[PDB]
Symmetry: C4
Subunit: 387 residues, 4 copies
């Protein structure tokens, strides 16, 4: 076993090839499948796994009642091989958690699981399944983290956590973790910024995170930093707004776009020079549809012009959270870090007449060969027998 270098650049990509689809909700109609949300993908040098937050209950069972609720003592972080349904019969237990992150440094898995009360939550860090550290809420207001993979470079892994209001100024910290131990942290000096649920990836020995402004921005905030946690911050400038909800496309801003800025959804983007690959819902008002857009000057430019659009989920179909994940050369044999992404397909409450809320997933990887747009939706027929 050797630790991931993380020193190569992102692979340039022209399109996205479908990588996985689990059909979790369809199968859970009869099969024993966990009620889950906040799924994400992360890979080791050997395999890729789907991580997810269970509700400690199964689909089509009475205990799925009220699962629109975000935090409870019953939620646990678990994982299974990519593309398989999250079942009690194929899932590895990771941590007790209602907010989480995970990543592999080349040697072992790091998992971060936050549980406990809203006014004093504690993140439990595990390395190879052994508790190695903890960090407790510093603002006493729902300590929370990525809900996607952390990023590793030369034996160090990095994540971002938030503590404070979800509708106003909060506090944001970056962490450097080695063998499950926090070796350094810094609080971001980001007045008037809002960071939630960051999607972080490694690129040329540094980390880039694209996050969610739940306070007053319909474009996405970003933070980038080196291994010493020296950071820069900003917002994606493109007039192709990335959050949901959001305004119709027009002239963007390199600061938070106030129009339709409140609320949001976890998302991601990949930076290539001044350009950006943007993943976003198709609807401006609800979590419906999904598309990938290549905007060659969208990181720093404010116009609403773009070069490529690829359909992922039809506008009449439910989507939800999305996040980045990468495949290192140690896994692929390539000379660059390959960008991939996943999409959570949320079914149930609040928009559908069920007693439960749960999601399935799809994932794609970036390639330079031919690709095609389509719609790969959840496909479940609601309501269920339980309702």
């Amino acid at each position: 076993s050797v630790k991931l270098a993380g020193n190569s650049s992102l692979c340039p990509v022209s399109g996205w090839a479908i990588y996985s689809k689990d059909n979790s909700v369809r199968i859970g109609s009869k099969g024993d499948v966990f009620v889950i949300r906040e799924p994400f993908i992360s890979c080791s040098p050997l395999e890729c796994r789907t991580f997810f937050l269970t509700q400690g209950a199964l689909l089509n069972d009475k205990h799925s009642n009220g699962t629109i609720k975000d935090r409870s003592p019953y939620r646990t972080l678990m994982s299974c091989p990519i593309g398989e349904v999250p079942s009690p019969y194929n899932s590895r237990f990771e941590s007790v958690a209602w907010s989480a992150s995970a990543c592999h440094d080349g040697i072992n898995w790091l998992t971060i699981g936050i549980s406990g009360p809203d006014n004093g939550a504690v993140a439990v860090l595990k390395y190879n399944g052994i508790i190695t550290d903890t960090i407790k809420s510093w603002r006493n207001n729902i300590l929370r983290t990525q809900e996607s993979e952390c990023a590793c470079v030369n034996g160090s892994c990095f994540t971002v956590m938030t503590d404070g209001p979800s509708n106003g100024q909060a506090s944001y910290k970056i962490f450097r973790i080695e063998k499950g131990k926090i070796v350094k942290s810094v609080e971001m000096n980001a007045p008037n910024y809002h960071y939630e649920e960051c999607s972080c990836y490694p690129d040329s020995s540094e980390i880039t995170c694209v996050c969610r402004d739940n306070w007053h921005g319909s474009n996405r905030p970003w933070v980038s930093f080196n291994q010493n946690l020296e950071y820069q911050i900003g917002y994606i400038c493109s007039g192709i707004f990335g959050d949901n909800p959001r305004p119709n496309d027009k002239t963007g801003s390199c600061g938070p776009v106030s129009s339709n800025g409140a609320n949001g959804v976890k998302g991601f983007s990949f930076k290539y020079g001044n350009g950006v690959w943007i993943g976003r819902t198709k609807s401006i008002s609800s979590r419906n549809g999904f598309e990938m857009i290549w905007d060659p000057n969208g990181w720093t430019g404010t116009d609403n012009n773009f070069s490529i659009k690829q359909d992922i989920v039809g506008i009449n179909e439910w989507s939800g959270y999305s996040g980045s994940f990468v495949q290192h050369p140690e896994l692929t044999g390539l000379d660059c870090i390959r960008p991939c992404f996943w999409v959570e397909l949320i079914r149930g409450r609040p928009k559908e007449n069920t007693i439960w809320t749960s999601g399935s997933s799809i994932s794609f990887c970036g390639v330079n060969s031919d690709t095609v747009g389509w719609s790969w939706p959840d496909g479940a027929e609601l309501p269920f027998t339980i309702d």
Copy 2:
């Protein structure tokens, strides 16, 4: 790990010994078993696996509704150990696909999964579960492939794909793939020929494929080629017609036999000099029964005489697709490549009054010791509780 040589000849065989039976549909009446079709077997130097195209749903669940449908965003290629039922709890995810192929080169698994719209489908190639290449539809008319194992020789794997009409002249291409990367391809110059769903096997460093003419041939077309993709084409001459539907046996043709030539079923045959082992349905008009026939001059001779017939499935029982698979000396310890075959036993629509369509499987391997004919049918009692 070492590459399969694929340079020895096919083992001569006098009969077929039963190798596996999964009873998938019988078990799916209660258990959690995928709705599937287009199953096939492929082996590594260590194990044999059953691959299959799920419908992203389980038997006896409402989501099995309308699974007579061939192509959808929900279909996925998965695999499980041979003889086991295809379940969410024992199946490995391979690819998102409504048409597929797979094979092992001695080092890693190659999988090919085609998804996307009918007018621009994309084949995604994976090597050891990592995307290594893609190929997009070139005729914009349902890019499709074998639905059985590809064939590997000295580190190169080979497959055939079709694009264009299924009821007239189409386009057929042969591919050479190394470590999941397409290194060469050629379009077959085959006017008045039709190739669908090829069953390909290695033999003395070259590849032989026996396929399905869905246009105007009740005998089977074949294509053989060396590692450089230098090919030959023809039709099996035997008056023992191999396709379904077909006419009663009589004088055959070395070209397409037009009588009952439209439509068909995936099948296979093994060539031994001028002779051929033919696997076929027992019924000339429907997918019922199965039998193996040895015809000592059937590859090139047009008479309807044969030497050996072995019963596999009774004529009053449902059958379906069939395909070849081989076991290499690297797996068996033999000095030749052993021929085996599988049969898909289709239940449900359109011939049965259910809301669903699904199949189970049986498989056999060629031996020179004593064997016996019998009937090993699906055995499920329809309809089910869901209907």
Copy 3:
């Protein structure tokens, strides 16, 4: 990996310690558990597994209907770790079979599975899951075998098969198998003897089998042989009759005991000099209860006196088949071959008012430390919801 020596003697034992219990029928009431019969245990140098003949159906499902039937194309030999329920989710597929045997030579598993028509059945032999040989019925009357583990000595494995009437003189053959290949066989010259379902074990480089006389013997026939298949035959002389049905205990015979001699049940015994450990039902008329009896001169003596009796299953509880299995020094680290045994607990038809027949299992190993008698019955409550 090294082949088992099989050259040491049986470990002397004073009693039997419970080793496993699967509770299959109890669990199958809700869980997905195969309908099975004819289970048996066999061990490798690393683990012990339960082999069994499925009916290609699950408990409490309609396809369990009529499973009193012995032979069908749907029956398959499968295996799982000892003590676990036989489920589609934890069972390895072995062979298509309605009669079977299996054993490990120290290097790989040998399995023997008989399927096909009653008038021409074929035994398929597999070594490490690869077909290595076949043997076809020679009397055209239900070729059949042990339904328990074969016996291995220095790289050779041995079994017994029967072909012919089950109610009169039949034909019995011994086989020597190396790496799945039959290298020698001999037909036993046994006029007026009847051998069915032999329980065979290795002891001092030779094989001893205790079997079932279904024709006209209420005591058990035996056959012993060396690696060259030079054999001796006889019947257990003890007045403690071992079969079921049988007469009340009295003066025995070294030939077949005609009284209540027709019919029978698979059983076993362990020979120690002139002494014998006898496992048998508690009832003389039905498959109820089970007990182990140490009879210090019972192999050759005809009296009905014994020294030790240990209860295994209460007389008011269902039992069924029983068989021997051994643990070699290569597995245990002992300087002798340890004797163990299993008992099949049959539930359902014909004695119970259900539509199905299925069994669970218990097993015990011989020790020289303290033990105790008790009753470890199936424990299921019949009928089931399916009936």
Copy 4:
């Protein structure tokens, strides 16, 4: 593989971080989950496992009827990865048992499973799944053991067993076990003491056990011993009484506290010099709630003052058994033995109107970083559909 040294001291700890939660009962409402009680955790140098005593039945099935019953022939010791639900599809079979213990010596698993009649029960010892020894009841009155992990030091493992009345003076023995073989035992000379269900852990090459006085003590008895079984005995002196039921906290005793002394619950404590970490229910009269208390002089001091209290389960929630388990440096890479604990959350009879009784589990590990109290209850809604 190398033997665990067990020669380092316990890691000092300031609080407890949550390690696992299985949600077994919630999931068993639909999924196939064993009815269990008496769960416990034990680790090897590679992984941690949950052991448990099944009732040979699944939740929400009719065979769960009457599972308040403690001892039957159907109960089995099985294990699964920590945090996973105990299911037939993910559980390893260990032994037939209605009382049990297990631990890993660094090389292999030792399991101890007691079954048989109340008047002559037999403990079966297995090393790497092979029977290595047995010990039979010496008082003919329910031979019984820890219901938690045994303790290993330098290749020797240690446990405590009890035989005799559970409501008066009984007999208590300490055992030293090497490779599954009992090499030494001693009967504790403990007049007026009562020992049940000991929680034992290694510390500086010696063993410390904290147990349950079911006769006449509301504080917990303890026994400590070296590898030669030279022992000391006493009771925890703290006025913070550890058993359930118990009186309100007040002046304690270094002998058995008679007030509310009859009956009790399995529990644990960790000794640090004169101090003690006490785990106990929150209710003084029933198995409700759970908390960890640090009492700096509680081992030898009788006052009712303490320094730290951490909530684990709310007082309005069901708890049950609790036990210690440790993680050795060979597993963690630390320079000390890390203390952890588990809690059984019992649902059903006798306090709830169901036909069944079963439990789920949570576990925590000691750390010196920040922690938080909360409530992590079972969370199931009773009754179930079966009742």
